[PDB]
């Protein structure tokens, strides 16, 4: 629970009430990631289902099993498309977990994805100009 998330939401709300739209650059990132993930799963369904078939999460799955599958996804280098697939992969694991009435695994998967991004992907993201570069390239 972030105090900064709470501050930014309250100020944004209070500004919109007076007619002012405080631009949050991460809002554009979130929207582009949603759309790119939708497009990846629909237009490249064979690539998407090939990734989701490699892991099914149970309460006994350790992070290292998720890390090994994702490491194989990035085996030939990081690019923004593989990063989209990584988000779609995690979302498919969460949908599956909820399907199987194991909703607690959603928060676990979300923590694994953040760990992987911060340990494996964040230097590359910084070198390539941060998430704003993703937005500019996707539209």
């Amino acid at each position: 629970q972030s105090n900064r998330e709470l501050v930014v939401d309250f100020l944004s709300y209070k500004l919109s009430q007076k007619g002012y739209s405080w631009s949050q650059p991460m809002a554009a990132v979130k929207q582009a990631l949603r759309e790119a993930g939708d497009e990846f799963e629909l237009r490249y369904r064979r690539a998407f289902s090939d990734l989701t078939s490699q892991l099914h999460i149970t309460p006994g799955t350790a992070y290292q099993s998720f890390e090994q599958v994702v490491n194989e996804l990035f085996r030939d280098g990081v690019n923004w498309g593989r990063i989209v697939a990584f988000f779609s992969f995690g979302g498919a694991l969460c949908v599956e977990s909820v399907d199987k009435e194991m909703q607690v695994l959603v928060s676990r998967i979300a923590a694994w994805m953040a760990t992987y991004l911060n340990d494996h992907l964040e230097p590359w993201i910084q070198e390539n100009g941060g998430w704003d570069t993703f937005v500019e390239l996707y539209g």
Binding site: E35, R43, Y44, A47, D50, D76, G81, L137, Y138
Partner: peptide
């Protein structure tokens, strides 16, 4: 995108 799609393996926004 076309540039990301071209990094798929041939077997496979």
């Amino acid at each position: 995108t076309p540039e990301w799609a071209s990094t798929l393996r041939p077997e496979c926004p």
